[PDB]
Amino acid sequence: FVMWKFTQSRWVVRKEVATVTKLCAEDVKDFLEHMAVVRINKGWEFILPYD
Amino acid sequence: QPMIYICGECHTENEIKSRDPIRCRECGYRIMYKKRTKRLVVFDAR
């Protein structure tokens, strides 16, 4: 689901993923840290640019 | 008199009498705690 959200849009909200997937905060954080970085006022951005 | 205890992993109320090998049903754990008392205890918020 996280990878699909990243394919649909470059910016992913952590709270939306936590609400949809019904998962705890730490699992969503580990899922995001593997492929995203925290950008202030924008959420989570994919670590690599569009190739 | 029914003496009740709690297992360490199943956490089920087991009634065993005196001089019984400490065990628990549907498992094999051998750690048996005692339930909390029913007497009233007064505490101070200090």
């Binding site: 952590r14 709270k15 936590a18 905060a25 202030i40 006022n41 924008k42 959420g43 | 709690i6 956490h11």
Partner: protein, 65 residues
Amino acid sequence: MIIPVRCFTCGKIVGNKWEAYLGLLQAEYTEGDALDALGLKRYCCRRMLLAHVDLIEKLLNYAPL
């Protein structure tokens, strides 16, 4: 273990602002802006909420249940 209800120095009610703070951590707010939005002007409540470690869930993971 758990968030204290009263602040050690001043005594402002801080136990009720813990989980909401976690919500501000679940949101995009940082530490400073979240502590400001919670209404903690003096730095004592900021230290109380920031330096607190949530060890209650780690203990409940070892609870009998």
